Amino acid sequence: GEIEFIESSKDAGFPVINTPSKTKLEPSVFHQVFEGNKEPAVLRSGDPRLKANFEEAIFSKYIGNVNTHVDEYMLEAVDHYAGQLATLDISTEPMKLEDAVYGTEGLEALDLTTSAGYPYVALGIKKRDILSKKTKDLTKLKECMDKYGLNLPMVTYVKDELRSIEKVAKGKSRLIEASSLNDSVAMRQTFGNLYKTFHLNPGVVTGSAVGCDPDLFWSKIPVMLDGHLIAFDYSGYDASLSPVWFACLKMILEKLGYTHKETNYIDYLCNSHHLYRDKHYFVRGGMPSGCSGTSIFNSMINNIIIRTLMLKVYKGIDLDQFRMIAYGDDVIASYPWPIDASLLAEAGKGYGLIMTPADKGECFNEVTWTNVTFLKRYFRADEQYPFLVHPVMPMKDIHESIRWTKDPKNTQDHVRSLCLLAWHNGEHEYEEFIRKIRSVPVGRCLTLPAFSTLRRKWLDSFHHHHH
Ligand SMILES: N#Cc1cc([N+](=O)[O-])ccc1Oc1ccc(F)cc1Oc1ccc([N+](=O)[O-])cc1C#N
Numbered sequence: 104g105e106i107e108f109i110e111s112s113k114d115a116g117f118p119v120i121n122t123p124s125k126t127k128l129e130p131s132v133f134h135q136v137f138e139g140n141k142e143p144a145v146l147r148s149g150d151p152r153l154k155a156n157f158e159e160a161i162f163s164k165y166i167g168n169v170n171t172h173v174d175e176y177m178l179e180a181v182d183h184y185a186g187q188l189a190t191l192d193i194s195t196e197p198m199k200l201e202d203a204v205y206g207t208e209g210l211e212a213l214d215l216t217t218s219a220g221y222p223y224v225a226l227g228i229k230k231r232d233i234l235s236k237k238t239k240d241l242t243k244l245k246e247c248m249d250k251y252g253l254n255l256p257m258v259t260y261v262k263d264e265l266r267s268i269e270k271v272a273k274g275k276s277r278l279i280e281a282s283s284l285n286d287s288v289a290m291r292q293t294f295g296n297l298y299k300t301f302h303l304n305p306g307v308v309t310g311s312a313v314g315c316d317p318d319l320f321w322s323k324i325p326v327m328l329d330g331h332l333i334a335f336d337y338s339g340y341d342a343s344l345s346p347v348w349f350a351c352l353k354m355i356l357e358k359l360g361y362t363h364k365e366t367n368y369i370d371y372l373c374n375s376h377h378l379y380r381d382k383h384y385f386v387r388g389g390m391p392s393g394c395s396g397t398s399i400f401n402s403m404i405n406n407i408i409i410r411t412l413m414l415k416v417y418k419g420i421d422l423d424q425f426r427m428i429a430y431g432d433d434v435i436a437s438y439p440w441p442i443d444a445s446l447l448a449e450a451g452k453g454y455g456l457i458m459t460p461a462d463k464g465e466c467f468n469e470v471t472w473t474n475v476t477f478l479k480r481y482f483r484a485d486e487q488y489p490f491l492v493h494p495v496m497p498m499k500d501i502h503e504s505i506r507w508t509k510d511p512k513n514t515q516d517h518v519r520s521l522c523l524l525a526w527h528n529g530e531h532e533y534e535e536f537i538r539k540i541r542s543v544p545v546g547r548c549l550t551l552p553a554f555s556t557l558r559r560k561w562l563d564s565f566h567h568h569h570h
Contacts, residue, residue, distance in 0.1 A: 104165045104342040104389020112383045118225050119381045122260055131508040132545045139503040141265040144276040152271050160274035161261065164342040168388045169455040171347050173354065180410035181351055183422045184403075185358040187308055191300050195360040198295030204288060205239050209299030209314075212236065213291065218281035221256045221378055223247075230284065248285050254371060255283035257391060259379040265507060280377065282394035290368055290395035297359075301399050305570075307426040310406045312433075313398045317480055317494035318523075319564060325472065325482065325492060328426050330437030332470040334477075335444050336459035340432035341390040341401060345455045349373040349388070351407050352400060372400070401431035408456065409436060412447040428477070435477045443467070483527070491565065493527040498536070501525050505540075515549050526557040533557075 112119060126143040148157045173181075198210075206212035215230045223229070233243050262277040270276070282290075291298070302314030307327045312320065337343070353366040372394060375386045390401055409427055413420050420438075427436035444467040448458035460467045462476055472482055481495040501521050508517065518540060526533045533554050540546040 104344060105168050105387050106162060106165050106384055107387050108385040110383055112378065112381050115383055117256070117378055117383050120224065120258055120378055122380060123263070126263055127509040128263065128265065128507045129509075131506055131511065131514070132543050133540065134506040136539050136543055137502040137506055139499075139506050141267055141503045142271050143507070144262065144264055144266045145271055145274050146261045146263060146276065150274075153274050154272040155274045157274040157276075161276055161278055163275075164278075164339040165386070165389060166339065166343055166457075167455060168345040169347065169453070170345075173347060173350050174411075176411045176414040177347070177351050177407065178354075179414060180407050181355050181358070183410055184310065184406045185355055187310065188355075188359060190308055191304060193300045193359050194296040195362075195365065196296060197292050198299075200241055200244075200288070200292060201239060203291040203295045204234065204241065204244065205236065207295075207299070209303045210291070210295055213287065218258060218260070220258045220281040220283035220286075222251065223284060224258055224281070233284070244284075244288065248288065251283075251285055253285055253289050254376075255286055256376040256378045256383070257282055257394065259377050260393075263509075265503060277392075279393035280375075280391040282391075286371065287395050293365055293368060294396055298396060298399060301402075305428070307428060309402075310427045310429055311399065311402045312428050312430045312477070313402055315430075317478065318561065319570065321480070321482060321492045321494040322490065322565065323570060324428070324435070324477070327428070328435065328437035330424070330426070330439045331441050332472070332475055333434075333436040333438060333442050333444055334461040334470045334475055335434065335448070335467070336461055336463070337432045338457040338459055340405075340456075341392045341397070343455050343457060344388055344390050344401075344404060346373055346388045347454070348404050348407065352404055355403065355407065369400075372397070398431045402429035405429040405432065405434060408451070408454070409434065409447075411454070412450045413438075413442075416446045416450045417442070430478055433478060435475065444470075488562070491562075495527045496524045498525065498528055498532060501536070514545060518546075518549055518551070522552055523557070526552075526554055530554050 124147050126146055128143040145153055145157060150157070202210070204213050213234070215234060215236065217230070218224055219228060219230045219233070233247060234240070257280040260279050260281060262279050266276070301309050301311050305312045305315040305320060306323060349369050349372065353369045356366050356369070372391055373388060375391050377384050377386060390397055406427065406429055410422055410425070413422065413425065424439050425436070427434060448467065451458045461470060475482060479496060479500060481497070483493045483495050485491040485493060501524055505518070505521055508514065525536045537551060540549070540551070
């Protein structure tokens with residue numbers, strides 16, 4: 104991804120977008136009770152914690168493109184993964200607006216808390232001013248869509264979230280694109296059935312884990328990945344995606360039976376128009392994290408990518424014995440013979456991708472079930488039911504997250520959520536967690552699940568329904 108053109112908003116007649124200047128994260132009542140090193144990301148330019156230039160850092164992820172056509176490796180990659188998705192019987196038919204906007208099995212209702220984007224955001228108009236979760240009204244939306252169209256600029260927001268000292272210091276805050284409500288809805292219409300199928304079929308056929316529930320899904324993973332594990336990091340995945348990969352994506356959507364017209368939306372993602380604060384810029388390549396389907400699409404591409412590096416480096420490779428699961432840039436994979444991930448990483452670099460050893464590793468080491476992570480979680484078989492596998496989020500991370508809040512009114516929900524995570528570290532660990540929570544008076548006011556109830560409900564969860 105490369106920033107092609109940049110100018111002042113006033114010159115094209117765009118109003119300044121008034122994004123928030125201060126963080127919503129403050130120290131929680133638990134901030135002194137636990138250790139942690141992370142702090143809210145830098146959102147403004149004058150932040151005294153900065154040890155680099157902010158405007159420069161946030162955009163620097165835009166490292167460049169490699170100009171090329173789809174090669175022989177890409178094609179055969181596309182076909183293999185095409186071969187897989189066909190099994191699923193994805194409907195290329197649009198989805199009925201009601202479903203696309205207000206929910207259905209496999210596609211959550213369009214979130215009414217996020218930005219509506221341009222131009223509504225400029226006009227003080229909020230999502231809730233347009234949609235209602237009570238009347239399922241589409242009369243207003245239809246007016247706005249007809250009024251303002253598709254293909255609108257995107258609004259760029261600095262992601263307000265906890266980060267390490269290194270990234271606060273370097274100003275490497277992450278950017279999120281708010282798509283215009285219309286484009287959101289349109290895309291949901293066009294791809295809703297794809298999304299529905301992806302969320303209902305996490306695993307090695309979709310090669311996706313987007314929408315999954317670790318609690319249930321972890322147990323499936325080792326079953327699906329028989330082989331020697333392959334795992335690894337990207338750096339700036341979304342924004343390094345060159346246009347070539349989008350060509351491949353639309354190439355794959357075409358085999359699923361999407362028309363050229365219907366794939367024009369991939370271009371909307373690839374060559375993008377952004378309204379940042381008082382600037383207005385055009386970007387060629389780069390997945391614009393935050394528009395509709397960016398996770399699914401990031402995964403699908405990744406599915407293409409890895410199969411392409413396998414093919415180019417290991418002539419002889421049989422892909423039908425390959426298995427992968429992506430969540431956007433996060434990949435876990437297996438082959439029956441060892442694979443040198445470093446080879447792949449160097450190969451990938453010729454395509455403008457920065458691959459790295461898994462979990463900020465020193466070298467592309469042996470990947471076991473002991474050290475493998477996915478969505479920041481480890482795997483540990485339950486001591487008692489060995490076919491059951493715990494998703495184990497590290498305590499360090501739970502400790503980090505507990506020390507801040509964006510809204511103390513939700514403490515109960517927040518601490519329960521963290522509870523749902525921590526207990527996989529084991530009873531000793533869980534009881535220390537609970538004691539320290541409880542060493543503050545607010546901690547004593549919270550309804551907190553007992554370990555033994557967490558264990559029971561989990562064991563009980565793999566008793567009903569599918570997967
Ligand atoms: N469309 C849409 C859409 C709407 C919102 N929103 O705020 O209402 C947010 C993300 C949206 O994109 C997706 C819509 C449906 C999907 F099945 C998947 C979408 O993309 C994601 C799916 C999953 C995740 N995730 O959980 O990380 C992030 C994204 C993103 N961006």
